[PDB]
Each structure stands twice: as C-alpha cells, then as structure tokens.
Design a protein around this motif. Structure first.
Motif, PDB file in Angstrom:
ATOM      1  N   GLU A 232      33.341 -45.175  60.683  1.00  0.00           N
ATOM      2  CA  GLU A 232      33.984 -43.978  60.418  1.00  0.00           C
ATOM      3  C   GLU A 232      32.962 -43.092  60.294  1.00  0.00           C
ATOM      4  O   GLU A 232      32.905 -41.567  60.742  1.00  0.00           O
ATOM      5  CB  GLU A 232      35.063 -43.703  59.150  1.00  0.00           C
ATOM      6  N   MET A 233      31.834 -43.172  59.485  1.00  0.00           N
ATOM      7  CA  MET A 233      30.738 -42.255  59.343  1.00  0.00           C
ATOM      8  C   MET A 233      30.077 -42.047  60.619  1.00  0.00           C
ATOM      9  O   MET A 233      29.517 -41.034  60.796  1.00  0.00           O
ATOM     10  CB  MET A 233      29.806 -42.650  58.015  1.00  0.00           C
ATOM     11  N   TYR A 234      29.843 -43.052  61.231  1.00  0.00           N
ATOM     12  CA  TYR A 234      29.264 -42.952  62.577  1.00  0.00           C
ATOM     13  C   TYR A 234      29.744 -42.079  63.447  1.00  0.00           C
ATOM     14  O   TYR A 234      29.348 -41.211  64.302  1.00  0.00           O
ATOM     15  CB  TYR A 234      28.727 -44.496  63.254  1.00  0.00           C
ATOM     16  N   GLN A 235      31.236 -42.437  63.748  1.00  0.00           N
ATOM     17  CA  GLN A 235      32.238 -41.473  64.315  1.00  0.00           C
ATOM     18  C   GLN A 235      31.856 -39.921  64.033  1.00  0.00           C
ATOM     19  O   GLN A 235      31.963 -38.950  64.812  1.00  0.00           O
ATOM     20  CB  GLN A 235      33.534 -41.934  64.220  1.00  0.00           C
ATOM     21  N   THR A 236      31.833 -39.689  62.495  1.00  0.00           N
ATOM     22  CA  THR A 236      31.579 -38.466  62.121  1.00  0.00           C
ATOM     23  C   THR A 236      30.302 -37.867  62.582  1.00  0.00           C
ATOM     24  O   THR A 236      30.201 -36.769  63.121  1.00  0.00           O
ATOM     25  CB  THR A 236      31.597 -38.291  60.715  1.00  0.00           C
ATOM     26  N   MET A 237      29.353 -38.661  62.752  1.00  0.00           N
ATOM     27  CA  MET A 237      27.896 -38.185  63.479  1.00  0.00           C
ATOM     28  C   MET A 237      28.005 -37.778  64.801  1.00  0.00           C
ATOM     29  O   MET A 237      27.470 -36.754  65.287  1.00  0.00           O
ATOM     30  CB  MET A 237      27.063 -39.412  63.186  1.00  0.00           C
ATOM     31  N   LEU A 238      28.660 -38.546  65.590  1.00  0.00           N
ATOM     32  CA  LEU A 238      29.013 -38.300  66.814  1.00  0.00           C
ATOM     33  C   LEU A 238      29.892 -37.040  66.859  1.00  0.00           C
ATOM     34  O   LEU A 238      29.591 -36.118  68.040  1.00  0.00           O
ATOM     35  CB  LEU A 238      29.764 -39.384  67.637  1.00  0.00           C
ATOM     36  N   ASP A 239      30.805 -36.884  66.345  1.00  0.00           N
ATOM     37  CA  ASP A 239      31.553 -35.758  66.289  1.00  0.00           C
ATOM     38  C   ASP A 239      30.924 -34.447  66.046  1.00  0.00           C
ATOM     39  O   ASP A 239      31.016 -33.347  66.728  1.00  0.00           O
ATOM     40  CB  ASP A 239      32.681 -35.632  65.144  1.00  0.00           C
ATOM     41  N   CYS A 240      29.969 -34.556  64.953  1.00  0.00           N
ATOM     42  CA  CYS A 240      28.953 -33.372  64.796  1.00  0.00           C
ATOM     43  C   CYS A 240      28.036 -33.019  65.826  1.00  0.00           C
ATOM     44  O   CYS A 240      27.512 -32.066  66.070  1.00  0.00           O
ATOM     45  CB  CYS A 240      28.024 -33.765  63.530  1.00  0.00           C
TER      46      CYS A 240
END
Ligand SMILES: COc1ccc(S(=O)(=O)NCC2CC2)cc1Nc1ncc(-c2cccc(-c3cccnc3)c2)o1
Length: 266
Positions: A232-240
């Motif tokens: 989930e935290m890597y998904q958030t990086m990609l989103d950013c």
C-alpha cells in the motif's frame, strides 16, 4: 511589508544561554531559554543568529516574518521567539528537535527495525505526520520546494516536524518547466516516503542523475519498492509520482489515506 509584533514575539537576550552549535542553516545553535513559553521552565531551543550584510539581516528578518505569517502546527518546526531590539545580535528562536533529521535517524535504526525498535506503525506514523504538516503549509498557501527526509526533524514522543525555512526530489515539470507548485511537493513527498521505507537510503540507488535520468523520468520510469515498504505504501509512492500533477493526490487526500493505513495497521 509584514509587521513584527514585539509584544507577542520578543524574548530577552539575557534569558537565552548559548549552547552547542548545530551548524550553518546564519549560525544555528542550541540554547537554553528560560520562560519562553511563559512558564517558569528552562527549555532547550534552536537559535538562528546573524554573524553583517544588510542582505543577510533582511533574509533573516524575512524568515522571522514568514514564520509568524504561517503560524503554528505540531508538524512544523515552530517559531518560539526572537531577539530583534538593538544592542545584541538578531536571533530567531524555534523549537529544538533533539533526535535530528529523519534520514540520519532512520539509517541509525537499520538493525533496530521489525515490521510488527522501529516498526511499520512508526514509519506510517512519520509519513502521516508529514502529510498533515504539508496539508497545513498548503492551507497557508506555501510551497516547500525541498521536501526531503533530511528536512524533517524528529523531536520527543515520535513527533516529526518539517523544517519550514535537489534533483532526485524534483517533479518532472519542475526540472523541465521550472514550475514549483503544491502538486510538485506531492511528488517530493513520494520520494520522501521512499526515503522513509528504505530506512534513510538515498533515492535512485546507483543511478547516474543526468539528461537520460530526466528522459526516463518524463517517460514513466520510477523507483522500485524500497526494502521495508508495504504494498500500500509503494502504491502511494506511485500515486504521488503521477506524470500529471493534477492526478497526484492532494495533501488532504494523503492525510485521509495515511490515517486509514495507520488505523488498519493497528
Ligand atoms: C541534536 O539536534 C539536531 C541535530 C542535527 C540536525 S540537522 O541534521 O538538521 N543539521 C542541522 C544543521 C544546521 C543545519 C538538527 C537537530 N535539531 C534541530 N532542532 C532545530 C533545528 C534547526 C535546524 C536548522 C535550522 C534551524 C533554525 C533555527 C532558527 C531559525 N531558523 C532555522 C533549526 O535542528
């Protein structure tokens, strides 16, 4: 053109006891301040003081007025006072964060981390607190421009604070269009998240940062997941790191999302 309300902010020089240097931020030192929050307590604070060109005086006085204008939030490094009256050096007094910067700190805990010692709770919590600090800064209509783990400080009880006063952190549109906006800070925040979940590693490990790096960046190349991330935290990086600044989350959306991840973790 901004005001300085000495009644509110002015602190006596004789109630500041000079301590250990922190470095060059303007000389930044630790000091012990008696009564700075109006209570009968001695508190360690951080002081920026002037060595003196008009340009340098102006820059420090401008810093002081901006900190006033911005106002208080838990997750920024707050103004506590200033010494501006004639007859001593110009000094700007802010909160002292005894554990230093987040990058150096996380590196120091590489062998003191277990997912469930630092834990995932701690990292998601640091991440959440930064987003809250940035949401605050955006509401005051600021852009940070060097949002990076080295500019986050750690104070007591796991409180992190953005130093409110770097190509690997820059959004593609900032590199190519010179544009700094709040959405470009969201990109930097994604790099900072990677810094957090790499436990203080340097971004883009073993990548030459050149015209080809910038090319791959415009084209959609991104960092791989760091070693201590959740999916989930890597998904958030990609989103950013969305190519379109308008498709990146806002800081408000990140505070909501990270709050949910923090609660889901517990
Ligand atoms: C043991 O504590 C530390 C150890 C190391 C750091 S640091 O890793 O950030 N390096 C500081 C150097 C001066 C650039 C920070 C802290 N703690 C700290 N607390 C506050 C600040 C700080 C750091 C830089 C600038 C200012 C400052 C002070 C007054 C007005 N404007 C800015 C304050 O630093």
């Amino acid at each position: 053109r901004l005001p300085y309300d000495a009644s509110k902010w002015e602190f006596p020089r004789d109630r500041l006891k000079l301590g250990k240097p922190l470095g060059r931020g303007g000389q930044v030192i630790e000091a012990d301040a008696f009564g700075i929050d109006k209570t009968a307590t001695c508190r360690t604070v951080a002081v920026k003081m002037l060595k003196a060109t008009h340009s340098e005086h102006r820059a420090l006085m401008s810093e002081l007025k901006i900190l006033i204008h911005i106002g208080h939030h838990l997750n920024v490094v707050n103004l506590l006072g200033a010494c501006t009256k004639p007859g001593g050096p110009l000094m700007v007094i802010v909160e002292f964060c005894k554990f230093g910067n987040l990058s150096t700190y996380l590196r120091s805990k590489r062998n003191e981390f277990v997912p469930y010692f630092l834990t995932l709770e701690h990292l998601i919590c640091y991440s959440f607190q930064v987003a809250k600090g940035m949401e605050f800064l955006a509401s005051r209509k600021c852009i940070h421009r060097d949002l990076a783990a080295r500019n986050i400080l750690l104070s007591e009880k796991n409180v992190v604070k953005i130093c409110d006063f770097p190509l690997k952190w820059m959004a593609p549109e900032t590199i190519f269009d010179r544009v700094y906006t709040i959405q470009s800070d969201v990109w930097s925040f994604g790099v900072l998240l990677w810094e957090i979940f790499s436990l203080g590693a340097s971004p883009y490990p073993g990548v030459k940062i050149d015209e080809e790096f910038c090319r791959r960046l415009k084209e959609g190349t991104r960092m791989r997941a760091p070693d201590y991330t959740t999916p989930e935290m890597y998904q958030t990086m990609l989103d950013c790191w969305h190519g379109e600044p308008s498709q990146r989350p806002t800081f408000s959306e990140l505070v909501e999302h990270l709050g949910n991840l923090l609660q889901a973790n517990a």
